[PDB]
């Protein structure tokens, strides 16, 4: 029963050492690439966004793949936001108050997400090689994708996204979002708010090509936040009294989609589902359960099953809204297919009506 998921959960421990030595690998070259960057005109403000829930600047989102996140600071800056989507935003400034760093990517008085993408890639490229301390090589996509992916001796591989940082309020599609009010409180809801917010240039599906001066509003920083600061209680978890297991079904529903992505992977009809699909149902299930008592270490077999069953759900309506901007659908035809929605909804509802199955030993 929930035996099983506990000692699924033993197991996933056993890993520790080689995520551990491999995220230091990926610290290394990252280290290096910001020394470089800095020494451009465009990046100088350049640093590293400390996004990740027990590494600082290497977050994990797959066995071998890590995500991190370099941020720019980009002042004066106003968002146009492109044909209603909620999450895709044109990227323009208020004034000239003093010509800025970045005005080579300009375009009349839109901010080009594909220029300053490109010279991104160019500079990293240029260092990839000179370090020979460790071969790392680059890989393929740049189509609406932020991500610059490496490969580090030949296992490890690693994205890094360029982010601007906009101390700004919130764009008004996320002010329905974050609906934590009842769970971690309105006064939690409104310091998050006050935070920082950030823009990837990802590229909104346009017709079967992309938008490619359009950014996307990101929030991938405030998960660490929440993560590690996730009860009713300001001390949950703090005391052998309150201890629950958020922690322990999240981490139960990424290893779940890892397992069948693994098993799937002969026809690929699971290639578009991410950790980040995962998560975003994950904080939904907390929302919905605000309780610290409705996550008992004792009933984890339960809550697993509540946040398979949200999952579930929202496979089956292909509706997963972004947890900040509800009008967003994680799930959308135009986003994942109908074909590879219907798919995980037969193999997730299979293993949940067997307890689980892809768990056995
Ligand atoms: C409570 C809470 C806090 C943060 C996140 C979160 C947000 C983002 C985001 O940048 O929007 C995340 C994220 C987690 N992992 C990755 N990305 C970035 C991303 C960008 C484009 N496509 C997919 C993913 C969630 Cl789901 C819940
Ligand atoms: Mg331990
Ligand atoms: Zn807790």
Redesign the pocket.
């Known amino acids: 029963g929930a035996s099983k998921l506990r000692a699924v959960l033993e197991k996933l421990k056993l890993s520790r050492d080689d995520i551990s030595t491999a995220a230091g690998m990926v610290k290394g070259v990252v280290d290096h690439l910001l020394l470089r960057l800095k020494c451009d005109s465009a990046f100088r403000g350049v640093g590293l966004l400390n996004t990740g829930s027990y590494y600082e600047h290497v977050?994990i989102?797959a066995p071998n793949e890590f995500?991190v996140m370099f941020k720019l600071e980009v002042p004066r800056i106003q968002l146009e936001e492109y044909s209603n989507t909620r999450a895709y935003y044109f990227v323009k400034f208020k004034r000239n108050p003093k010509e800025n760093p970045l005005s080579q990517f300009l375009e009349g008085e839109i901010l080009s997400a594909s220029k300053m993408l490109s010279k991104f890639r160019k500079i990293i490229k240029e260092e990839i090689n000179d370090i020979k301390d460790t071969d790392v090589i680059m890989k393929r996509k740049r189509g609406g994708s932020?991500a610059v992916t490496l490969l580090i001796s030949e296992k490890i591989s690693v994205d890094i996204t360029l982010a601007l940082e906009s101390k700004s309020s919130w764009p008004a599609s996320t002010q329905e979002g974050?609906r934590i009010q009842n769970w971690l409180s309105a006064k939690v809801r409104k310091q998050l708010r006050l935070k920082p917010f950030?823009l990837?240039p990802?590229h909104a599906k346009e017709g079967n090509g992309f938008q490619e001066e359009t950014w996307?509003?990101?929030?991938?920083?405030?998960?660490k936040?929440?993560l590690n600061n996730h009860g009713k209680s300001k001390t949950c978890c703090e005391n052998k009294e309150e201890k629950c297991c958020r922690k322990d079904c999240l981490k139960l529903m990424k290893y779940l989609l890892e397992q069948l992505k693994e098993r799937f992977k002969d026809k690929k009809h699971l290639d578009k589902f991410?950790?980040?699909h995962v998560?975003?149902a994950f904080?939904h299930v907390c929302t919905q359960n605000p309780q610290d008592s409705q996550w008992d270490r004792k009933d984890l077999g339960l809550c697993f099953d509540n946040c398979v069953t949200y999952f579930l759900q929202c496979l089956r309506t292909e509706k997963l809204e972004?947890?900040?901007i509800p009008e967003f659908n994680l799930f959308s035809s135009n986003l994942i297919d109908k074909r590879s929605k219907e798919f995980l909804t037969k193999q997730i509802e299979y293993e949940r009506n067997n307890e689980f199955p892809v768990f056995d030993e």
Not at 216 to 223: G, K
């Open positions: 977050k989102s995500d932020p974050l950030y990837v990802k996307r509003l990101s929030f991938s920083h405030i998960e936040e929440i991410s950790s980040y998560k975003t904080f972004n947890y900040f």
